[PDB]
Every structure is written in C-alpha cells, then in structure tokens.
Amino acid sequence: AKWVYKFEEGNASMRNLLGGKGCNLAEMTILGMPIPQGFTVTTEACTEYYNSGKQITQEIQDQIFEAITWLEELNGKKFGDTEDPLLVSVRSAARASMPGMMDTILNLGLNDVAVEGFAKKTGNPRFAYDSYRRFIQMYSDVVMEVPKSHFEKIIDAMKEEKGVHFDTDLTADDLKELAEKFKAVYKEAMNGEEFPQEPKDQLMGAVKAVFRSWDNPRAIVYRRMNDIPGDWGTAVNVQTMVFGNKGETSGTGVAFTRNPSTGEKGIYGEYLINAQGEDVVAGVRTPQPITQLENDMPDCYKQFMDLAMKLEKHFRDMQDMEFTIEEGKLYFLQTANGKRTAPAALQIACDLVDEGMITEEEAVVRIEAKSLDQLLHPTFNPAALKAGEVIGSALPASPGAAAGKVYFTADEAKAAHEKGERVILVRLETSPEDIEGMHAAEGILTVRGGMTSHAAVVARGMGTCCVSGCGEIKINEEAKTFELGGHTFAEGDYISLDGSTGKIIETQEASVSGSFERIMVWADKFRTLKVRTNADTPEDTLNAVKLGAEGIGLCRTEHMFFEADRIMKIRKMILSDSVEAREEALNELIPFQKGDFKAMYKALEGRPMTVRYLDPPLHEFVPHTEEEQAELAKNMGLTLAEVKAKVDELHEFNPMMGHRGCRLAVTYPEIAKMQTRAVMEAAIEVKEETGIDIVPEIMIPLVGEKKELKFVKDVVVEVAEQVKKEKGSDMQYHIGTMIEIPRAALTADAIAEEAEFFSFGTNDLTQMTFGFSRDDAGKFLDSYYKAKIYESDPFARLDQTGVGQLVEMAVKKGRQTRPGLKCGICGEHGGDPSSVEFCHKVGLNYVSCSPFRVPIARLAAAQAALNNK
Amino acid sequence: AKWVYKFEEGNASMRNLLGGKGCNLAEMTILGMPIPQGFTVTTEACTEYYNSGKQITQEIQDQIFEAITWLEELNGKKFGDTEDPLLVSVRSAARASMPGMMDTILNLGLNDVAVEGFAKKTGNPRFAYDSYRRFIQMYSDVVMEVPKSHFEKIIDAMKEEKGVHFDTDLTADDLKELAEKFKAVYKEAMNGEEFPQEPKDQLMGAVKAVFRSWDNPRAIVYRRMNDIPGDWGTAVNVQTMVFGNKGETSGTGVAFTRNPSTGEKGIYGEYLINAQGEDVVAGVRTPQPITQLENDMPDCYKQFMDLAMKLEKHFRDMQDMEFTIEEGKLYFLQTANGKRTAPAALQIACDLVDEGMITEEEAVVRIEAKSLDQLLHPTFNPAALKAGEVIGSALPASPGAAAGKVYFTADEAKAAHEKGERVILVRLETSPEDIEGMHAAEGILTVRGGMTSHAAVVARGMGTCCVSGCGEIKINEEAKTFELGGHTFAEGDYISLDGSTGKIIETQEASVSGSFERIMVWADKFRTLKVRTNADTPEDTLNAVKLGAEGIGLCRTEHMFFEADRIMKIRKMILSDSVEAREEALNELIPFQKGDFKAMYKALEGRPMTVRYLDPPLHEFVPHTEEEQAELAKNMGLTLAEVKAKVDELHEFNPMMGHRGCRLAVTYPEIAKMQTRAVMEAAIEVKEETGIDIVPEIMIPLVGEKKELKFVKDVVVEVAEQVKKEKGSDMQYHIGTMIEIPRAALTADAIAEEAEFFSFGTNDLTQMTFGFSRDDAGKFLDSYYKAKIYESDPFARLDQTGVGQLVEMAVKKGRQTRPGLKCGICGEHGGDPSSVEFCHKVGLNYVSCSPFRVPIARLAAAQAALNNK
Numbered sequence A, B: 001a002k003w004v005y006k007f008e009e010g011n012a013s014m015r016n017l018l019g020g021k022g023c024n025l026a027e028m029t030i031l032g033m034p035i036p037q038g039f040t041v042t043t044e045a046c047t048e049y050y051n052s053g054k055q056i057t058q059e060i061q062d063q064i065f066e067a068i069t070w071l072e073e074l075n076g077k078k079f080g081d082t083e084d085p086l087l088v089s090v091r092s093a094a095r096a097s098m099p100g101m102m103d104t105i106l107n108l109g110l111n112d113v114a115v116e117g118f119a120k121k122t123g124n125p126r127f128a129y130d131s132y133r134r135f136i137q138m139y140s141d142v143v144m145e146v147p148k149s150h151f152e153k154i155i156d157a158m159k160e161e162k163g164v165h166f167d168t169d170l171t172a173d174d175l176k177e178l179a180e181k182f183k184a185v186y187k188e189a190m191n192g193e194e195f196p197q198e199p200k201d202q203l204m205g206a207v208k209a210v211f212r213s214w215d216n217p218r219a220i221v222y223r224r225m226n227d228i229p230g231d232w233g234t235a236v237n238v239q240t241m242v243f244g245n246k247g248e249t250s251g252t253g254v255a256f257t258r259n260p261s262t263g264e265k266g267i268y269g270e271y272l273i274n275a276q277g278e279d280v281v282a283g284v285r286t287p288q289p290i291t292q293l294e295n296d297m298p299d300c301y302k303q304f305m306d307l308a309m310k311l312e313k314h315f316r317d318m319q320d321m322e323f324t325i326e327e328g329k330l331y332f333l334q335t336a337n338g339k340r341t342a343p344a345a346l347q348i349a350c351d352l353v354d355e356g357m358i359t360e361e362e363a364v365v366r367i368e369a370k371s372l373d374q375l376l377h378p379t380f381n382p383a384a385l386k387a388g389e390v391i392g393s394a395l396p397a398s399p400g401a402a403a404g405k406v407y408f409t410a411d412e413a414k415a416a417h418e419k420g421e422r423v424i425l426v427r428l429e430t431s432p433e434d435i436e437g438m439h440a441a442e443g444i445l446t447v448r449g450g451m452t453s454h455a456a457v458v459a460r461g462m463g464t465c466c467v468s469g470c471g472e473i474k475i476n477e478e479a480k481t482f483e484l485g486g487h488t489f490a491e492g493d494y495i496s497l498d499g500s501t502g503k504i505i506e507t508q509e510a511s512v513s514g515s516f517e518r519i520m521v522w523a524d525k526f527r528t529l530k531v532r533t534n535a536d537t538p539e540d541t542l543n544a545v546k547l548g549a550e551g552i553g554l555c556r557t558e559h560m561f562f563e564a565d566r567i568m569k570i571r572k573m574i575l576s577d578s579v580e581a582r583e584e585a586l587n588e589l590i591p592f593q594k595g596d597f598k599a600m601y602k603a604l605e606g607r608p609m610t611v612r613y614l615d616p617p618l619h620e621f622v623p624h625t626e627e628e629q630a631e632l633a634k635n636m637g638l639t640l641a642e643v644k645a646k647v648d649e650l651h652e653f654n655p656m657m658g659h660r661g662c663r664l665a666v667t668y669p670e671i672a673k674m675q676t677r678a679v680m681e682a683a684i685e686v687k688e689e690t691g692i693d694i695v696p697e698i699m700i701p702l703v704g705e706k707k708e709l710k711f712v713k714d715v716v717v718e719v720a721e722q723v724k725k726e727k728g729s730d731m732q733y734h735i736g737t738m739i740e741i742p743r744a745a746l747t748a749d750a751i752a753e754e755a756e757f758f759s760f761g762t763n764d765l766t767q768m769t770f771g772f773s774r775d776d777a778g779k780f781l782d783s784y785y786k787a788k789i790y791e792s793d794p795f796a797r798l799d800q801t802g803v804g805q806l807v808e809m810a811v812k813k814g815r816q817t818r819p820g821l822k823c824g825i826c827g828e829h830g831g832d833p834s835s836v837e838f839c840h841k842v843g844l845n846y847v848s849c850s851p852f853r854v855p856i857a858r859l860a861a862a863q864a865a866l867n868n869k
Helices: A012-031 A043-051 A058-074 A114-120 A125-142 A149-161 A174-188 A199-213 A217-225 A277-281 A298-314 A342-355 A360-365 A369-374 A382-386 A435-440 A454-462 A514-526 A538-547 A564-575 A579-604 A628-634 A640-650 A662-667 A669-690 A706-723 A742-746 A748-754 A762-769 A774-786 A803-817 A833-842 A854-867 B012-031 B043-051 B058-074 B114-120 B125-142 B149-161 B174-188 B199-213 B217-225 B277-281 B298-314 B342-355 B360-365 B369-374 B382-386 B435-440 B454-462 B514-526 B538-547 B564-575 B579-604 B628-634 B640-650 B662-667 B669-690 B706-723 B742-746 B748-754 B762-769 B774-786 B803-817 B833-842 B854-867
Strands: A004-006 A038-041 A088-093 A104-108 A235-240 A251-256 A268-273 A319-325 A330-337 A390-393 A400-407 A423-427 A443-446 A465-468 A482-484 A487-489 A494-498 A501-503 A530-534 A552-556 A609-612 A697-700 A734-739 A757-760 A822-825 A846-849 B004-006 B038-041 B088-093 B104-108 B235-240 B251-256 B268-273 B319-325 B330-337 B390-393 B400-407 B423-427 B443-446 B465-468 B482-484 B487-489 B494-498 B501-503 B530-534 B552-556 B609-612 B697-700 B734-739 B757-760 B822-825 B846-849
Touching: A004 A012, A004 A058, A012 A038, A012 A043, A012 A088, A012 A235, A012 A298, A012 A330, A038 A058, A043 A058, A043 A199, A043 A235, A058 A199, A058 A235, A088 A199, A104 A125, A104 A199, A104 A277, A114 A125, A125 A149, A125 A174, A125 A199, A125 A277, A149 A174, A199 A235, A217 A435, A217 A774, A251 A277, A268 A277, A277 A319, A298 A319, A298 A330, A342 A360, A342 A369, A342 A514, A360 A514, A360 A854, A369 A833, A369 A854, A400 A443, A400 A465, A423 A435, A423 A494, A435 A454, A443 A454, A443 A494, A454 A465, A465 A494, A514 A854, A514 B514, A530 A538, A530 A854, A538 A579, A538 A854, A552 A579, A552 A846, A564 A579, A564 A628, A564 A640, A579 A609, A579 A669, A628 A640, A662 A669, A662 A706, A669 A697, A669 A706, A697 A706, A697 A757, A706 A734, A706 A748, A734 A742, A734 A748, A734 A803, A742 A748, A742 A762, A742 A803, A748 A757, A748 A803, A757 A803, A762 A803, A803 A822, A803 A833, A833 A854, A846 A854, B004 B012, B004 B058, B012 B038, B012 B043, B012 B088, B012 B235, B012 B298, B012 B330, B038 B058, B043 B058, B043 B199, B043 B235, B058 B199, B058 B235, B088 B199, B104 B125, B104 B199, B104 B277, B114 B125, B125 B149, B125 B174, B125 B199, B125 B277, B149 B174, B199 B235, B217 B435, B217 B774, B251 B277, B268 B277, B277 B319, B298 B319, B298 B330, B342 B360, B342 B369, B342 B514, B360 B514, B360 B854, B369 B833, B369 B854, B400 B443, B400 B465, B423 B435, B423 B494, B435 B454, B443 B454, B443 B494, B454 B465, B465 B494, B514 B854, B530 B538, B530 B854, B538 B579, B538 B854, B552 B579, B552 B846, B564 B579, B564 B628, B564 B640, B579 B609, B579 B669, B628 B640, B662 B669, B662 B706, B669 B697, B669 B706, B697 B706, B697 B757, B706 B734, B706 B748, B734 B742, B734 B748, B734 B803, B742 B748, B742 B762, B742 B803, B748 B757, B748 B803, B757 B803, B762 B803, B803 B822, B803 B833, B833 B854, B846 B854
Parallel strands: A400 A423, A423 A443, A443 A465, A530 A552, A530 A846, A552 A609, A609 A697, A697 A734, A734 A757, A757 A822, A822 A846, B400 B423, B423 B443, B443 B465, B530 B552, B530 B846, B552 B609, B609 B697, B697 B734, B734 B757, B757 B822, B822 B846
Antiparallel strands: A004 A038, A038 A235, A088 A104, A088 A235, A251 A268, A251 A319, A319 A330, A390 A501, A400 A494, A482 A487, A494 A501, B004 B038, B038 B235, B088 B104, B088 B235, B251 B268, B251 B319, B319 B330, B390 B501, B400 B494, B482 B487, B494 B501
C-alpha cells in the first residue's frame, strides 16, 4: 500500500519516493505557501507499474481515485462534475530534476459536456473552451496519440482565417471551433478512437502515460547522458488546477532567484499574462521579464518576490519556480533547486557561502563536478570576434562560444558526429525528440523561445551554448536553409555565443573565475586523494600543474619511440637480428629520450612523474604500407621481402593481448635497460643542474605474474644502479606496476612483493574483465544501452560491480604484503567523478586524469571525502 | 643624541628610525640569528645631515666612531689595524624598501698597508687583494668619484691579458696589480686625490656619501614614482664584514621564500661560490639557483632553509634575504619582506591566509593597491604568440608581455615617451641611472643578469616586464644595434614576455586569477565606500561593472553632442540666432541622445548613473579649420564669414573659466531642458520595458553659487516633471552638483539647500585651488619636482593640504544643511589609493574612477577602512 501521498504528508527528504518535485511540493505545502493542493503518485508505483508487466494495479488505481475523492471534498468541486468539474494537472516528477524531459497535462477533467458546465459555472466561455482546446492538445500529445504538428497547424490557420493573430485573440467561438478540430485530430491520430470523455479514463491514462514514458528511447538516452539510473522512476503529481488563462489579470511564468546561467544573483524569469503555463511561456508569444510584472501587477510582485526569497532561504540555494496568478491570485506551482550552468553554480556557491547561507563544505558538495568541463571550454578569440560578421542578436540562454556546421535536425546534427564535430543545431524550437542532436551540438540556435524555453533550459543543464528567440530567422528544411540579416545558409558553418550575438570564429582557451578558484581551493582542503595528471609532454604537464595536478601518474613513453627523428632506431631494433645490434639500435635513442625526461623533470619542478614502460606491441612500430616498407628496406639494405616478411612476423590476431607491454621486456630486456638509462640519466642530471630532489617512478605495464614483474624489475634495478656512476646518485627510485590484467588483481599480494606501487589501468582492466575490446564494442554497445542492459558506458564510468571488485581486492591484498603500498588510478576513469569517489572509498592514494579533467577530479575528490567521512 | 643604534637595541617597530633594513637587522639580531653585529646610523641623522647644511655633526661623527670602538671590542679586531684590521660593510637603508636604489660598500677599512696585515693574518693574499680591489672599486663608485665604466674595463683587460677568464681566476698578484690600477683610476677620476687610506676617513665618507645620495636626482624621481616622501631619509648601517670571497667553500646569494614574481611558494634565489655579495651575484658570472646549494653544500642548505622559514614565519610574510657562507659558515646579511610582483602579492596573500599565517584583513592591507594595474595589463594574444618568431630565450624576471620599439638607453627610452609608448629597454645590465627609462619601458631586456639582478629586481617592483640574462645578444650603441638568433636590430620593434621568450605581437586583455578575486572579495567585506565608475559608454560600463563598479559617478554627455551623426545639430544650435531655432536644433538630438541613455540604463541593470550636464564651452563644438567652417556654412546657408565670425565670437582666453558648464545652462536653458528630456524619457522607457527601477541622477557642473544651481535646477525639474506624461512616472530623480570650484566648497552649506548630492571633481578643484592649468603646468611642474617643491603630482594624488581642505569643508557644511547628503569623488583621484583613504576619512560615500581603476579603488577602500577604524 501507499502508492499515493498527499502533499501534506511529506518533506524534502522523501525525494526518493516523492520524486524531487513532489517532496518540494510537499515541503512548500508544509511551509504554508499558496499551492493548489494535491497528491503524488510514488516513484515506487512507477517501479510497480513496470514490474507488474505494465499494468496499473487495483491497489494503485483505487488509491489514486481515492486521493481524487479527497480533492473534491477538499475543494467543493467534483471531479468531472457536469456543471462544475474538477480539472487537475498532471506532471511527472522523477527523483532527480531533468530539463525538457517532463510530461505535463493541465485542465485534465474536461469534456464535451463539462466545458459548458465550466463555462456556466464561470460566465467565461473563451476561458472554458480555451482550456478545453489546450487539454485536448496536451493529453493527446503527452499521452501521445498525436503530435504538436497537427495542432499548431490548426490554431495557426484559424488565426489567419480570422486574420486575428494571437491565440489569445480567438473567441469563445473559434475556441470551440478549434476544440472541434483538435478533437478531430486526436481520432485521426488514433485507432479512430474518439477522445476520452471520462475524467477517470483521462486521469489513469495520464498517470499511465508518464510511467510508460520513463522507458522511452529518448529518456533512456537522457538518463545515460545524465548518469541517472533507470530504476528510480518518475512520480506522478496531481494537483488542483489554477488558471493562468482566466484572462487579463491572470498569468503564469517561470522564474529563478539567481541567473541560472551566470549565478549572478537577483530575480530572473519570464512570463505571459492570460496564458497557460506549461505551454505558452515556455515558447512562442514573447514572454515578458519577470521584473516587468512589477509594472503590470505590483501587488503580486511584492508577494511573489517575498516568497521566492523565502524559498531560497528555505532550501539554502537558488530556486527554479513555476507560478500562476489567477485573477490577481498568485500561486506557486513547483520549486526546484535551479539547474545551473557551471559558472553559475560556482557563483551561486561562493555567494551563498559569502552571504552565510551555506558552508564551503556544502558549496563543494553541491557542484556537479562533471560540469567543470564547461569552464575549460575554448572561448572566443577577441580579435576573432572583434573582427566578426554579426548577422544576428538574440537571447543568451546558455553561456558559451559555439562554432560549427549548421544542421536543421537532431537527427542530422547527431549524424554529423556528437558534441565536438562543430555542429550548430538550428531550430524553430526544440523538444525532447531533439535531446540527442542537442547534446551533440556546439550550441543551439532557436527561432522562437525565451530564457525559459526548452532549449535555454536544456542547454544550460548540458552546458551547451544557446542563443534563443531569434525571430528574424527564416527557416526551411525543404531546402534546409535559413536567413539572417542578409545571408542565406544551407547547412553552412555558423558561429555564435551567449552574450547574444550570432555571426557568419577562433576559439581559444579558458581563464577561470576566482569562484572557480575558491571552489578549487575549498576542494583542496577537503580532498584526501592527491591528483596527478596523465601527460607525456611538458606543455601538457604545465597545464595540469596549473589546473592543480600534483604530479604525473602516467607518462607514456611511446612518443619517445614514435617521433620521426626516432622511429627508424626502433625499426632498426625490430628488423635487427642480434641482441648486439638491437641493443645498439636502442642505444641511439637514449640521447633523444633522456632529453625528453629532462624537459619533463624540469617542468615538474620536483613533482613525481610515473613513467610507463614501452606499451604497444612492436607491430605498431613497423610500417604497413609497402611504400614505406620499401623505404625502410632501402635504408636498411634489406629487401622489401625481408622487411614485410618480418612485419608479417609481428602481426597478431588480438593485439590487445599479444606480445607487448612487459612481455616485450621479458624478451627484449634491452628496452627496459635503455628505458631505464634514459630515465635515470635524465633525473640525475636534472637533479644535478637544479639541485631539486628527483625520485623516479618506473612502471612496468601488463604484468600478470610476480615472477614476471621481478624479471623486469631486476633488469631495471641493475641499470638504475649501474647509472649511479655519475655520483652514485643514491637517487632513490621506485619500481611499481600497472594493475591492468585481472591476474594481477587476483595475485596482488604477491605482485606487491616486488612492486613498490600499483597503478590501476582501469581502461584495460575494464576491457579485460568484460571481455570486450573498446575498439570493437560499439558495434553492440548501443543495443546494450537501448536495451537497458547497460545504463552506463563502462569505459567512461568505473564498473563498480565487476571492475571495481578486482581493483578493490588488489588494494586489500597488495597491502597485505606491503602496507604502505601506494595505489593510483589512471584510466579515463580518473576524471570520472563517480569512479573517483569509488577510488576514494576503496583506498587509493591518488588519481590521475588528463590535464583538463584535473579540476574535475579535484572537486570530485573533495566531495568523495565530504561525502564519505 | 642617539644618531647611532646597535642592532641589539631595536625591533621591527623602530623602522622609522632604524630604516626598514635596520629594524629587520635588529629584529633578527634579537631573534638570535647568525648576523655580523653592527650599528645603524639613524634616518633622523640623515635628516640631521640635511638640515645642518650637509655636515656630519660632532655629535654624530663622534657617535659613529664610538659605535666602531664597540665593534673592535666586540670582536678582537681593530678598525683598520695594520695587521689585523676591521673591515666593515656600509649599506644604506631607508624606511621603505626600494630596489636598485641602495648604496653598498663592502670591505671598508682596507688600505695600502692593511691589505698585507690582512694577507698575513689570513695566509690568503688573493683574498686580501681581491677584497681590496673590490673595495677601492665600490667606495669610489658608491662614494662616487668614478664609475663602474673604468673598472670593469680593467678587470676585463687583465683577464684577456692573462688569457684566464674569471676574475676568480686572478692571483694574489694580478689582484694587487689590479688593485694597483683601480687605485690609479680613483685619482684620475678625481682632484688627483689619492684614495683615502684612513679607515676613519673612509667610514665617514661612506656614511656621508649615502646621505648625500638621498637627494640625488635619480632618488628623487624614484621617490616620486614610488610615492615616498623625501623627508624620511636613509639610515646607514654598519656591520662587521663576513667574507663571501674567502674561497671555494664560501659564497653569497639572494633568496626569497616565495617566487617574488609568481607568489608561488618554496625557496627561490641565486648565488655564487667564492664571490662578493653585493656585486657579483647580482650580475655577470652565471649565478646558480639557490636550490643547487643543496648539492654543493648540503649542511648549509638545511640550515639556511630552516632559517629562511623561521623568518617567514616570524614576519608572517615572504622574505627577501641576503646571505653569506664564509668557509662553511652561513650568515644572514639582511632580510626584507620581499618586493613582489602584483600577481605574486595576491598569491602569497591568499596562501598565508589559507595557510593560517595571516587574516584576510592583513592580506588586504598588505597589497599595494596601486599595483593591481599590473593584473589588467593586456596580455599576449595566443595565436599571436603561437604564430610568433621566437628569436630568444632567457630569464623570466618580472612577469608580463612586452612589445615595442627597442632602445639602447634610458636616456632615449624615456625620450621615446614613458611606459606606454611601446618601448623596449635593451641593455647589458641596468642601473640606478637607468631607473627612469626603465619605468618608461614596456619591458626590459638584459644581456647579463640573474633573477636577483638589478633589472629583475626593479621591474618586479615596477611590475614592468623583464627578460634577463640573455647571453646571446650582441649589443653596440655605436651603431645602436643588437643581435639575436640571426636577426639584427637597430631601435626596431621587439617583443617579449615573462615566461622566458623573446621574439621578432598582439596584446589582448586580463583574465584575473581567483586570488585576485578572493582578494577583491575580502576587500568588499571591509570597504565602506561604494565604488562607481566613470564611463560614457556601455562597454566601458560593462567592464567596470564586471570589475566591480557599483554604478556610475560620471557619465559625460559630450560625446552625445560630438558624434558626427549629431555634431551639426549643436552647430546649428550655436550658429542659430533665435531661441526658437536653437531650441529646435536641440530637439533633433533628443532622439539620438535618449537612445544613449537607454542603452546605458539598460547596461547598468538598475545601478545608479550620475549623468553630467554639458561641460565644455561651445567653442569646442565649432570647427576651427576654415575648410570645415566652409562646409558648415554651405550646409547652413551662412557665409564663411558668417560662420568664422560667430566662431570667433565663441573664442575665449581662458577656456577653463569661460562660459561653459552650467554657465551655458543659465544662458541656454534649452540645453538643460533637452538634456533632461533625453535623460528622463530614456529612464522612464527603460523603466517601462524592463520593469527595473531607475532613479536618475542629474548633475550640474561648474556651479559656484546656490542661486545658480537653483536656476538650472528649476529648469530641470520642470521638464523632468513635464516628462511624467507617460505615466507621470513619479520616477524619482536626483539633482546634485559637481563641487569643482572653490566657491562651491566655501559655500557648500548653501549649495546644499538645492543639491541633493555633491560630486567632487578634484581634477578641476585642483586646477583651481593651485591656480594652475593641467595643460600648461608641465612647463614647470618638472622643475617643481626636481627642486623638491612638489614631491607628488597634484593631478594624480589628491593634494590633501589645500585641495583636500576645500573638499573636506564642503562635506562638513553641505551636511550642515543636508545631513543625509551623499558625496562622491570623480577625478583621477578616485583610483588613487591615497586619495581614497582620504575620501574615506573625510566622509565621502563613494568614489569613482575608470573602469580599470576600480579594483584599485576597491582594494584601496578596504584598506582605507581597515586602516581607519
């Protein structure tokens, strides 16, 4: 039992049950704010629907109807009465807020007969029909039978037919004429089924519709792209209806107590007088700035304002609130902690902090570590813009600089490769359908929409760029072109930015606010994990160090063998036939490589850098085109056959588990020796010239057995030893390993007899545990996602149930043999907030991710600790 | 009495007496650090010298000699004894540290005979002569008889003559041979006077030399450019000498506990083994990084390190310290709170703050508000550099991007217009002589020098850019060319930056650290004054608002009449012959102007903006070339004579006190009316479209009598009233005034019967009080400075003794009539830290300066309050 809850029986805490919205709805109810009373149908009832083979149970169905009875008795009106019906609103609400994805139906409980009783119990026909026409429209759209296409094409004609141009211009007539039509499209767009006239059939079908929505393709991809588990489920709230379309002194609007896009503090929002919330303000007819309501309805402003703050103060954070004035009566519909843009989050955080509302601890815990990627977005180059063709101006929805080939559909924006293929989504407006092409674009361009529009809203969440409500664009898919200022475009290349302008540009680099830095700072007081980066070069090293990297967890050495001015040596080593020649071949590189390490060691100023031995199998080193093989042979005296034949010798079926990594060192110790000399000579010298202590870290890859690490460790040590023949350094160095094979995790305690430290290469540990190659997975990963087999991408988010197990028991065991054993992570999982919290709990010492993910990890680790203490 | 103090009888507090250095010297003495004992000759003794018509009094002279006796008895050696003399060091020390300006003499107490006693009491001849040769050199340079020219030209020859290349390569022979020579140049470079051989004559002449230095041209300009009052005076410290040139296990070096140029934390510094401090490390022979001493003399490193920190912890801030190892014995010579670069200051501030050493209150008080100008320095454009000709690499002394025409002398860098004429000072090394061309350049380029070099040092203070120790440059004034990489230059155009590189560039814009922002923030918690800006445009307004401007204190309206698409209207107004035509002329502008205010009012989002009425006299509006006058006439039907004759009518002898400002409004009310309409229509409309409250601020300039403000106030009000005929607004507006005339300050209490607020235009108040025109002053201001009549520039630093009086009594009186009267400042004095503290104490409400000075004022006002509470 308890599939339904009243608002009066909740709080912010039952978010889980009550969905985010619903607990808030409850929470405000308890606060005493003017909200239309109602009930929420539990998230567990969603779950329930789903388990119960998509059937609304007796227990529930009943339970809802029961709640409905309470409403009627609650407020004199009877649910669907003939002359004085109850019309409620239906709005889905999952546990975690999520923009442009929520299903909303207003005026539900209206039909062919009640529209009249309603018109009589009101004296306002235009009102009744207007609502009725809207509801027929929503329900069949949300409840999806038919789509907004053939609706807007009707209210549209009617406006032209009538010459009168605002929907708000139609009469109690046209409105019934219009409701005549719509209700005609519902059945066309149906099994010829005539629109349900039974309130009860309507209510169930809405509650139902929602649930059935929560497993929709689109939601699923949104739940993925948003790291949300699809076993949560939406709640369905039902509320008594307030009418924003009652007429001239009625209205609805969305507001936010701080700029959702700048954090900048003070009321922000839009609205429309005499209009319906859930549809109207969020789109078309140019909504007015909530600040203007001061003008229009000053006694509501004061009130609404006082209340918005009462909120913010209440939830200690910026609020996103839907409200309605019904004939001079304001109502709150729903509050939500506003979805912000990264910079905005940072800003509100500092502010609430400085203002005294929240501690730094909460400021830290409240940022979505994953969004900092937003701050490091290449901005626009000044003289680039300065000297740029401004062909447009509009709404600065979500901040940023966009620039890329314009496309007229998600369906094709997407197709042109996700969010990085420099694509601009050009649309009249967007919708949940669009969700994917949006995520894929540099920024979204809309023809019609406010700050509260769907796109403004979604982008800001996704931190994509957005310029909305650009009237002046003349779009046409049929030609797939648009017009602005004087230029015509056809999937061309467009460029824009949040700060209004859109033009016919060079992107450059961040330059992070100080809110970012105080954030980054408070992070640093709480974070236990250190944060090294993954860099192979000094610039990259410089960048991270600047983002706050505390060293290097993965310096890869392949480029030291790849670069042209080095390649042939390895190629000689490969093609060579004797250890003496091979050795020698190698020898030549020492100098080029020792130089690399030097610049590295110099850049770091004494911060650790984990150097990773030669990784790929040799094949990667030879040339596969017999044009280049022909070269090589010339330059070697071999024959084209001598070469290719040797190449073909190096060829492997499953290169991911061939002969590479340490396997190479067991057979070609020379490498480990040459590598060690390069390394050691370098640090000793830099130690010489600077006076800075260096303590080299050598990491042997692909180790699956102790005895196999010991072999290579021996070879390394002898040389690291033989190198202290400058000053016998007595440079201390560390030999550790990559745990990227499951045997290694299984045998960690032994791996640890020889390894001074463990570096988790989750990227490979992942492909091994799962048994699937990254390169090849995608031919099926999608169907995996589509089919809910996998909610998360396993190469981007640490599989904590399998992969995190191996990692976990490797820490536990490596530490049985070596208690002060240092562990680190170095996959992409390092800049993965979740993974980080994992590594934090699991006991790792440091994490490691790209120069850019650093701030992410930093934040993340602070949370990890705050969360887990 | 008390012209001399021992170190043991002081502390950091007597800085005033004891000079900065000396109190520190004392302070460390008291701490128990290894410092050669000594005495300081008071700053008041400097004063004393000067007042007493440049004579070292009996009282003093005696007093010094007495202190000297104490030394001898202090440490077995006798001052100038024949076989075991006392050689001391002499180093000037004023009350406020100041780079590249301090006079230093080491080994003083040596002569023709003692060099031997010294060589015998030592067994080290090369040592004795080496010192002796250095001292003959310093003294005659510092004590200035002769200059480093003909010295380095001698040790130079000797090196070549001897083929041996390091001075450290000369023998106990060459050294006496060399001392033979030097001592020969002293008398050449003299009244044929043979170098004083009397310790006592030497000691006095040094103490003397110093004092006489403190009124040197150069110091004076440095004291100006550094806001230091020349009535302070240097102290002269005398200390027992420690020898860094004793040989291979001796040395000297300068260090700093945090990068003086990045704030970046951890020991930074340079040094030379067997070398003299004060001369050697700071220049030529490539000094080693203080971190390398770990290598060389590890038991000293530990010690020196422990002590450096003991310091920092002691003075709660980064330390600049001179030290010497004498045969494995480390000594501290002097500590000083290091002079930093802006960014470095910010950084150390946050850090000491976060580390727990200092409060935010001190972090704020410790920045030199005047240096923030450094952060807003146009940086380098990425693709500009990215795609730039790197012809050089060297030391990143003082951070920055320099770019400008290269010059081989201050004497000509200067000449090419000060620090903004895009000039690069190209030098082998620099010196106090150079001080001015340095201050004038975009950055300094040196051929030889370390981090601790003179230039590195000076620039960092002046926050000029600096790339030092560029061996590879081949310089020649004789052709005035240099060579780098492969290009030859001749006063060309060079570009560089602190981050090493120097190339054959586009500058762009700041992007302030977050240390800047937390700074800027703590500032904001303490500052009482609000900070509006001075902007006439929206971009400028946008920038300030972004730097933290809290409105506009001065929106100038001339550009609204100047712009081409507007000029003729004012010209018609001028040339017109009837109020009706004039009125009309005016009328046409209303629209162009109302638009200006609108964009303004929109940019501000409801922040105040003080609008300033028409200022200049009309003449500025007509054309003075009879080519343009000919145009105008055509376009007016007038004759060329009709026009010029009218122009000549507008001509005035002293345009600064002609008919302009409000005088115009008394005679041409139309302006005030047109201005008021523009303004009011604009704010009402913007108030309409946004819903944001606007509360216009109208400021009438050049008001010198109440009855005269009342006249224009009347006219304004009637119109502001007649404008509320849209919605009778009941927009509230404010009429206030500019106090820029002394009558106004004298009659403020009455001015206040009509003025809602006072805006101090110190720029004009200054030219009026002083009686001198800015434009014309410079023909004598310099001689004023040169002659010490004026230590500060009165148009850049508020004259608090005269001009601040008028301001001050205007607040006091305006407030006798209008208690809640708001006062504000709006000259350049607004971004003048000192002025700000003044306005803070005086009682102003807000200050106002350019978009860029804002952060300055912000900081400043926080200090103003912290200081004065």
